[PDB]
Amino acid sequence: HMMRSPYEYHHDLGMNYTLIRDELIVGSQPQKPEDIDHLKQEQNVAYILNLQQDKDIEYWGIDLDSIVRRCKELGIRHMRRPAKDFDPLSLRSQLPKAVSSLEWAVSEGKGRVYVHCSAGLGRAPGVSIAYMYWFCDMNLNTAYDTLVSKRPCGPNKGAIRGATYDLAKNDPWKEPFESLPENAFEDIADWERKLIQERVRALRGT
């Protein structure tokens, strides 16, 4: 067993994950049905949030149907909110829906939510940080540092900031997010946070 690179996916090492908050685990894709048994037995997982595109599951040669079947057998709910890999625009567009699924599953309270993409290095940490920022009473830099300190990875902060802009927006003719400096929407006022939480919850089951 040899040295590997630190911020890159090593699929041959099997499913890997990090517990970020009691309710929330961020990791790489389950590779076979036995990995679902591990999650249920060792981590009390009751929900899986899969952020991959079909193209990703195909590339990786994963039998998703057998994964999902085992989830159902064990009472786990499997959810899909796809986003494109290494694509901040995709992540930004899909963040509100992905976070809606996550936050719904947390609110149900039946067990831990396992949030993953192919590697759990971009998409899955990005969704998790947005959830912490919007729902767990922190600013964006705190939310960001809290995850990255536990699980070294490279989520796009701009994607999360831009989804925050998108959800706080009340004027369809506001200047674009792309014109604003790095600091815009890195914190949100209490009324904006309330607006965001309602809009995210309104996407539950869309």
UniProtKB/Swiss-Prot annotation:
Cell compartments where the protein resides: Plastid, Chloroplast
Domain annotation Tyrosine-protein phosphatase: ranges: 16-173
Binding residues annotated for substrate, in chain numbering: 7, 77-80, 85, 101-104, 118-123, 154, 169, 175, 183-187, 192
Predominant subcellular localization, coarse grouping: plastid
UniProt-listed GO biological process terms: starch catabolic process
Consequence of substituting residue 86 to A: Decreases starch C3 dephosphorylation. No effect on phosphatase activity with p-nitrophenyl phosphate
Disulfide bonding pattern of the chain: none
GO molecular function: carbohydrate phosphatase activity; phosphoprotein phosphatase activity; starch binding; sugar-phosphatase activity
EC numbers: 3.1.3.-
Motif Glucan phosphatase signature motif CXAGXGR, chain ranges: 117-123
Effect on the protein upon substituting residue 9 to A: Nearly abolishes starch C3 dephosphorylation. No effect on phosphatase activity with p-nitrophenyl phosphate
Shown residues in whole-protein numbering: 79 to 282 of 282
Keywords: Carbohydrate metabolism, Chloroplast, Hydrolase, Plastid, Protein phosphatase, Transit peptide
Name the record gives this protein: Phosphoglucan phosphatase LSF2, chloroplastic
Active site: 117 (phosphocysteine intermediate)
